[PDB]
Design a protein around this nucleic acid. Structure first.
Lengths: 122, 155, 134, 46, 81, 52, 33, 8
RNA sequence: AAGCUCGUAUCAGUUUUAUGA
RNA sequence: CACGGACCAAGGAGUCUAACGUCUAUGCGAGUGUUUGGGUGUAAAACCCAUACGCGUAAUGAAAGUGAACGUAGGUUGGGGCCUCGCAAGAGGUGCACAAUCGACCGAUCCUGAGGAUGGAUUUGAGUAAGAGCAUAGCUGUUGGGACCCGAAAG
């Protein structure tokens, strides 16, 4: 009546068509298989925390965080430097303010520590 | 009750075990849906073709201008080659650029609705146990006991 | 005016074939309207909600009538109580099928209706809102 | 400026003919079709 | 962000297998806890009547008429913290 | 289990096999029904005699 | 409820530091104006 | 350790 | 071209009668 | 008139795509869309899928804000069908979609003075008034791209 066509530039030079969608899925699965073949008994990814999303819109939702904290790791009963060797992602810049999020993470860490089998250095 | 299908043994005998129809054979057999889903699905395993981007542009031709009793088509400059003074850059020209060069960003794969796709797959199963559509499709199925044909798990 | 429908559905072609027979034979003005309605397009047959059927049964002296829809019957969330009648249509949405069966009534096809009402007796034809949409 | 009709020795040239002049107009039959239709537009819209 | 929700719906959020138990034997104090924040709706509005079954509504915002229509049916409107 | 039925669900998230819009695949059988043939007015010649 | 968070850099904002006050004032007098 | 995208 | 009505009493480069400067 | 056309072969011009739109077909339907990804695969095919997201289900106002049932969702006027009577013509009841007119609610807009109350009158809207859309495909239209094919006084 509206329409805006951004074809005033030399658009025909930069046209990326993703024919390799099927090729790149295979490529990532081969990558995962290789990583799991090198990291044999371990999962494939670090233990990630539970986290509340920002903004009025999404604060209903609970999502994965980057890492726990020095606080959540200490309350679980271990050190940050040792947590990384057991494959627990640690976030130094994140803060602890909500009690429900805190306790959920501590129990996630505690249940993780019961389920694991750490190998000795010998 | 969905009638029963006599399972056959690997030797070719009627095993007393009979199994009810899985109600997939009682789906609507739609020739129109199976067709219009098939065309889209058959387009999916398809590789891109395109002519070269530089094909018909690797020439330094220029028009001779009007008024010279010759066609206005752009002509190769220089001399002493035979290619000099002969038409380029057109779809009509020999060694010239094709009309609307084929590109890779043509649509190759076809998006189909998922329940529509499952409609066609259910209808296709439904038509495997018809015995007259099996003869219409091809398949020499005169000298067999019953359809749907079922063999024992030891297969 | 149309000879053969724009539809490629073989089952819709069979219902058209059935009602062309009944519309030319029985000379009842039911079958002529039904067979006219099957030649219409998608925009020309809007869906009849289960709410409109509920209205048509609240209707005075229209309790035990067999309601006929030539479009599709759609489910509704705004109603809570549904009467105990037989509904004839082309397609029923899974929810509306569930609602009609739960209430106690039957949900029948159009050929099933053609056996039950060949002259189109005790029937009521509802069509959906057209000019409501653009 | 002299009008050189492209016929005979003048037909089909890349550049200048034998006729020595600074400015010259090489001229066709197809040139008539254009310039006649460029007058048909001019004589109607003026 | 403010997605709206009519009182004409209001029961779609309750799963359909539970709705038979709730609609039958309409007893007070034992009401369905309808969570609209988790459902993905900000404000509650009124498009029509609900049955006489008690209803608990938890929302960021409600209308006057939507508040009144639940109260007349015998249900509470819990403004969230 | 893969496709579902009247009893079993589907194993596919929110899927049900489609419904027939006509019950019987045969129409001539439905024409031969007792109630229809009782409401039907008698048939003509099928092919007309050439008067004049 | 609140969980009394860990202290940061500019919360003890400009911690006095007896030595740097001395150094700044020490250079101030030496360098002139 | 995170719940995967998709269907197992 | 498409949908919805009535397939009609919906009308007509026409005549008549009456009304007309 | 003029312009093209000595003859033959082969090549030789409304194509692809993006965006938006009409009509039709199909799937599902107050929902709808798997294919960003993940799982799986006999391996670019096919077959499954969690979480979100898009458009729609609510609009109005500049924004703050507020937010669509007094009634069997409303009265009157028509209305395909259907129903009762009619040996038939016809009368009456019911009235679907839809069309006109008088009303109820939402929104902003003033008196009433209970501060802004009960009620009063219109204006606005692609309003509510018991949803109709989402997706794919086909014919196709408009606009942008070299854009039906060849040609221009060039910077």
């Amino acid at each position: 009546p509206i329409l805006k066509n951004h074809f005033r530039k030399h658009w025909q030079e930069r046209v990326k068509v993703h024919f390799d969608q099927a090729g790149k899925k295979v490529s990532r699965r081969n990558a995962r298989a290789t990583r799991a073949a090198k990291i044999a008994p371990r999962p494939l990814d670090l233990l990630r925390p539970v986290v509340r999303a920002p903004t009025v819109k999404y604060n209903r939702k609970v999502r994965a965080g980057r890492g726990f904290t020095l606080a959540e790791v200490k309350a679980a009963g271990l050190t940050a430097a040792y947590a990384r060797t057991i494959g627990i992602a640690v976030d130094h810049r994140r803060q602890n303010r909500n009690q429900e999020i805190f306790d959920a993470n501590v129990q996630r860490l505690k249940e993780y520590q019961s389920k694991i089998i750490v190998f000795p250095r010998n | 009750s969905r009638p029963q299908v006599t399972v056959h043994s690997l030797t070719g005998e009627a095993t007393a075990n009979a199994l009810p129809l899985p109600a997939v054979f009682s789906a609507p057999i739609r020739p129109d849906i199976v067709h219009t889903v098939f065309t889209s699905v058959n387009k999916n395993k398809r590789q891109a073709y395109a002519v070269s981007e530089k094909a018909g542009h690797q020439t330094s031709a220029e028009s001779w201008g009007t008024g010279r009793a010759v066609a206005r088509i752009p002509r190769v400059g220089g001399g002493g080659t035979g290619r000099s003074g002969q038409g380029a850059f057109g779809n009509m020209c020999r060694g010239g650029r094709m009309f609307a060069p084929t590109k890779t960003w043509r649509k190759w794969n076809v998006k189909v609705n998922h329940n529509e796709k499952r409609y066609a797959t259910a209808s296709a199963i439904a038509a495997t146990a018809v015995a007259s559509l099996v003869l219409a499709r091809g398949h020499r199925v005169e000298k067999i006991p019953e359809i749907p044909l079922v063999v024992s798990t030891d297969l | 005016h149309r000879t053969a429908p724009k539809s490629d559905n073989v089952y819709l072609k069979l219902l058209v074939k059935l009602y062309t027979f009944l519309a030319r034979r029985t000379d009842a003005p039911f079958n002529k309207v039904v067979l006219k309605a099957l030649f219409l397009s998608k925009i020309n047959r809007p869906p009849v909600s289960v709410s409109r059927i509920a209205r048509a049964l609240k209707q005075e002296g229209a309790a035990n009538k067999t309601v006929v829809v030539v479009g599709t019957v759609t489910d509704d969330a705004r109603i809570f109580e549904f009467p105990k009648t037989t509904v004839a249509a082309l397609r029923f949405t899974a929810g509306a099928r569930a609602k009609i069966v739960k209430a106690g009534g039957e949900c029948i096809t159009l050929d099933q209706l053609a056996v039950r009402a060949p002259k189109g007796q005790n029937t009521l034809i509802l069509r959906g809102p057209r000019n409501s949409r653009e | 400026v002299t009008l050189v009709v492209a016929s005979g020795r003048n037909k089909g040239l890349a550049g200048r003919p034998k006729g020595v002049k600074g400015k010259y107009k090489m001229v066709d039959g197809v040139m008539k079709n254009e310039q006649r239709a460029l007058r048909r537009i001019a004589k109607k819209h003026h | 962000w403010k997605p709206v929700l009519n009182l004409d719906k209001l029961w779609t959020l309750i799963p359909e297998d539970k709705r038979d138990q709730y609609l039958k034997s309409a007893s007070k104090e034992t009401a369905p806890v309808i969570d609209t924040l988790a459902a993905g709706y900000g404000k509650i509005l009124g498009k029509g009547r609900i049955p006489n079954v008690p209803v608990i509504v938890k929302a960021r915002f409600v209308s006057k008429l939507a508040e009144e229509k639940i109260r007349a049916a015998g249900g509470v409107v819990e403004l969230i913290a | 289990q893969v496709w579902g039925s009247e009893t079993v669900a589907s194993s596919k998230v929110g899927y049900t096999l489609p419904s027939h819009i006509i019950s019987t695949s045969d129409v001539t059988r439905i024409i031969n029904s007792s109630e229809i043939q009782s409401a039907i007015r008698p048939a003509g010649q099928a092919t007309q005699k050439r008067t004049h | 409820t609140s969980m009394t968070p860990a202290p940061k850099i500019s919360y003890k904002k400009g911690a006095a530091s007896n030595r740097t006050k001395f150094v700044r004032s020490l250079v101030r007098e030496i360098a002139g104006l | 350790l995170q719940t995967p995208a998709g269907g197992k």
